[PDB]
From a paper:
The GH45 family is composed mainly of β-1,4-endoglucanases from a number of organisms including plants, animals, bacteria and fungi. On the other hand, PcCel45A, a member of subfamily C, lacks one of the two catalytic residues and thus employs a distinct catalytic mechanism different from that of the GH45 subfamily A members. It has been recently proposed that PcCel45A utilizes an imidic acid form of asparagine residue as general base in a “Newton’s cradle” proton relay catalytic mechanism. Despite the same fold (double psi-β-barrel) and the homologous sequence, the PcCel45A structure is significantly different from HiEGV and MaCel45A.
Numbering used by the authors: 1 to 180
Amino acid sequence: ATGGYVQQATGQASFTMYSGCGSPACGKAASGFTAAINQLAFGSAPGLGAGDACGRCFALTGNHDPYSPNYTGPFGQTIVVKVTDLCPVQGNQEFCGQTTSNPTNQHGMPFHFDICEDTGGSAKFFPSGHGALTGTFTEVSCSQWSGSDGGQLWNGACLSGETAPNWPSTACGNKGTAPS
Ligand SMILES: OC[C@H]1O[C@@H](O[C@H]2[C@H](O)[C@@H](O)[C@H](O)O[C@@H]2CO)[C@H](O)[C@@H](O)[C@@H]1O
């Protein structure tokens, strides 16, 4: 996409969970299940505001524990998250280090979703004792997402991806150039 970001409506991803998504990089939180997506897919860098991932909805499915490869299941449920946040390259090399010259993370995944624990998404997705998974994602209509957006936290906050057709398309728009 514009800026060299890798923004595809379906693919393979790794998955983690994080705490504190009340002030996310898109500039609006949301009451439903939400996630951060890795910088290369988010469409912006730290401090540059919302990228074109902002507010898009994705169905996530975990099917492998890379830390416990002998574990055959059960995994969690497929959940639908709204992207509100950025998992930046800086400080997240294992999972969010995808760059245009090296587009997979240390688990070979081209995308990563960091699922917010606060609003319940990770409890539906991660079996107890299994904090990181790999699997698949598919962008879906936000008709499939339960919840309401929070208010703007600053000028330029954007979740307009929630009404956009699936990638390839433009809503909030990408900022700057993808990390190389
Ligand atoms: O770095 C992305 C993401 O990781 C989260 O911690 C992971 C950790 O990286 C992984 O090694 C462990 O097995 O599972 C935890 C939880 O999923 C961390 O909570 C996030 O803040 C961070 O953005």
